[PDB]
Structure 1
Amino acid sequence: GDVTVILNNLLEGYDNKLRPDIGVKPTLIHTDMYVNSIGPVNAINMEYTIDIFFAQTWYDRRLKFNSTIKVLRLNSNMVGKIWIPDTFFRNSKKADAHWITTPNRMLRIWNDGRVLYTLRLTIDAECQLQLHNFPMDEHSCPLEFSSYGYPREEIVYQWKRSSVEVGDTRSWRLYQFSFVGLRNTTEVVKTTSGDYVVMSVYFDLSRRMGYFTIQTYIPCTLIVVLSWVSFWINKDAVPARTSLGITTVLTMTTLSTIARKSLPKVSYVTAMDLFVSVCFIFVFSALVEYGTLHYFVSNRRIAKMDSYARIFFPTAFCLFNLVYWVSYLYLG
């Protein structure tokens, strides 16, 4: 067949070890990306999973051919025969191409030498999460790629018209986050082996709030309110108010165990930690309030401490909530 003749001629005398225009000009590569799905964001490992169809286009004058056929639509067979850019992902903790049922790769060569190379990738990309506002935290997780060995004088990457395309975002594996939008940038990073053109895609993510409201914020609030029931109980009910005071503390301690459930052991105070800790202080103080009241009135103004607590405790907790939610939902 004439196609066999064309393919044999293109590979005759062809050295895949040499970049196109090796001593003439940088090899300009045009990159596309189709995000199949953004997998789960792993806060503990500071990484997220992404699945893409990665496309790269460049010109290779050694692959020009003259025939009525205007494009050679090939499978992954010829990928290892021609020169392929050494594009790697800089923040990739772990990545792998797909091999079922065959190498998930595409190679198309036009008669003017333009080469389209596509392959499917699954990448575990590093994303350093600033969890200070958790669970009201927003992140922009990057995906950087560049040439491993070719500096900017030899390989230059460039986005196409539609840089990054996304399909049905509702089908993604974002359990804890909602996709907001994406941005793509281009920069030059200087390393010890030269300066490299680095292409980045940033995926904006906002954490969903529904689970934490039902699971933590409301139960912690109800325990705090239940601790105020003591202030309306007679001070002579020593077993009743002490049991109420210490059981809310035990409940609040139980509720505190899920505050850092799926997070790395960071040492700063998150928004969830601040709320739970303050709620613990409130139930702690309600029990200490009765102990002071019981001692001075009986176990020896303080004699009216119940009247003050019926106002101060709801007011201080309402004021805390007012400052807490304003400064975490509107003041960032």
Structure 2
Amino acid sequence: VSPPPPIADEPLTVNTGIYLIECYSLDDKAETFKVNAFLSLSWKDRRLAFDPVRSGVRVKTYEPEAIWIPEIRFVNVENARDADVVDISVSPDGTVQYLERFSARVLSPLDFRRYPFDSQTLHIYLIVRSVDTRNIVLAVDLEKVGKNDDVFLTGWDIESFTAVVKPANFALEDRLESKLDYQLRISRQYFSYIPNIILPMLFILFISWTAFWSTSYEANVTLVVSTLIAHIAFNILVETNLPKTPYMTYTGAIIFMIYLFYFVAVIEVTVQHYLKVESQPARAASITRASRIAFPVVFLLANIILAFLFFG
């Protein structure tokens, strides 16, 4: 119907609130995720009032196309949401209530740079379409924003779900619009990653350091190359759960470091053998005895430097 009359110079205020039911399917490559949630609205129009004399229970008719309903759009969504309108009720002064339910696929950036121990913020963006007579502004109702205890994400824990009360007023296509921001803070559960990825890798790296305790060329070659193939196959196994990231990550830095260490180990085995065939066993013995201590200390220092550069 017609919008509220412009006699009340105050912008029509719509108290919004989103109530989460469950968040599922947090895709990392497309950086999307689907949601299922309620959506509340409330606004006051003294042009449709309710006389107390009809009833004391505040008779609140469900009016289709008999009332002016402000319509809400989501910004970062691939498709329009699947709204299911439940009930609309009118107060005796005309403070009309509202209730819906939707499912949507949201687009939000992710940052996989602390990947195993990272934390994300997800955003949902709400605008309201202007009207000719009156004005509409958006406002947050703290008693309606919440989440169910049935909201589970596979792998994540949910910290907070708040809504910045300040709209970001701007002009677009020669039109002024207001925006609302809903933030969802989640942290990744990282205990399973240690015994699943980290410790077997370090076991395989430590196996190839037992070649500094031997003088047999063939055994040392077998050891280092076979462990290198092992590491390649473990990388193949790990990559299946790693989201494809066209940038730099702590895990890939570690993997490059392991690659480098493997190369240097092969170099040292070759140098020991070449020296020993040239009839200089003292120099080879010294070099292998040096390397025994040299390799782990350097590995530890490099790992400390990388954890300082990434998590500091």
Shift in Å, 1:124: 1.7
CA displacement at 1:242 relative to structure 2: 0.9
Alignment partner for residue 71 of structure 1, among 58, 82, 89?
A: 58
Measured after TM superposition, the shift of residue 250 of structure 1 is 0.8
Taking only aligned residues, the RMSD between alpha carbons, in angstroms, comes to 2.5
Structure 1 residues 21 and 27: CA distance shift in structure 2, 3 A: farther
Alignment of 1:228 with 2:213, yes or no, is: no
Asked if 1:42 corresponds to 2:24, the answer is no
**3-state DSSP of counterpart to 1:132:** coil
The equivalent position to 2:3 in structure 1, one of 16, 19, 41, is: 19
One of 54, 59, 73 as aligned partner of 2:44: 59
* CA deviations over 1:236-294 (Å, ceiling 9, x no partner): x2221111101111111122224543455332211111122212222332223212222
Which residue of structure 2 aligns with residue 118 of structure 1?
A: 99
- Alignment match of 1:274 (pick from 232, 253, 268): 253
**Alpha-carbon distance, 1:81 to partner:** 4.2
Q: How many residues align?
A: 303
Which residue matches 1:144?
A: 125
Give the whole-Å Cα distance in 1 for the aligned partners of 2:158 and 2:12.
34
Q: What is the letter of the counterpart of residue 21 of structure 1?
A: P
* Whole-angstrom distance in 1 between the partners of 2:264 and 2:186: 38
Q: Secondary structure at the match of 2:192?
A: helix
CA contact (8 A) 2:4 2:45 kept: yes
Shift of 1:96: 2.9
Q: Partner residue of 1:13?
A: none
Give the superposition deviation at 1:118: 0.8
Residue of structure 1 aligned with 2:293, choices 311, 315, 324: 311
Counterpart in 1 of 2:231?
Answer: 252
- Aligned counterparts, 1:1-332, within 5 A: 16=1, 18-21=2-5, 24-66=9-51, 67-72=54-59, 78-97=63-82, 103-149=84-130, 154-162=135-143, 164-168=145-149, 171-185=150-164, 186-187=166-167, 188-232=169-213, 234-235=214-215, 237-298=216-277, 301-328=283-310, 331=312
Cα deviations by residue, 1:40-86 (Å, 9 ceiling, x for unpaired): 321111122222110010112332121214434566xx345432212
Residues 295-304 or 30-39, more deviating: 295-304
Distance verdict in 2 for CA 1:58–1:304, change over 3 Å: same
Contact 1:46–1:128 (CA under 8 A) maintained in structure 2:
yes
For residue 131 of structure 1, give the secondary structure of its aligned residue in structure 2.
coil
Contact 2:18–2:37, Cα closer than 8 Å, also in 1: yes
Distance of 2:60 and 2:284 partners within structure 1: 89
Distance 1:222 1:122 in 2: 46
CA shift, 1:183, in A, is 3.0
Residues 154 and 136 (structure 1), Cα distance of their counterparts in 2 relative to 1, 3 Å cut: same
Greater strand content: 1
CA deviation map 1:128-159 (0-9, x unaligned) = 011111122111111111114559x7210101
Secondary structure of 1:34's match? strand
Verify the 8 A CA contact 1:259 1:272 in the aligned structure 2: no
Unaligned runs of 5+ in 2: none
Letter in 2 for 1:270: T
How far is the alpha carbon of 1:302 from its aligned partner? 4.8
Gap change, CA 1:210 and 1:193, over 3 Å in 2: farther
Amino acid at match of 1:125: V
Q: Determine what percentage of the aligned residue pairs are the same residue.
A: 20
Aligned equivalents of 1:132 and 1:265: distance in 2? Answer: 12
* Deviations 1:208-246 (CA, angstroms, capped at 9, x unpaired): 2123212221121111111111111x22x2221111101
User: Which residue in the other structure is 1:7 paired with?
Assistant: none
Q: Is the 8 A contact 1:138 1:206 kept in 2?
A: yes
Cα distance in structure 1, aligned partners of 2:5 and 2:218: 88
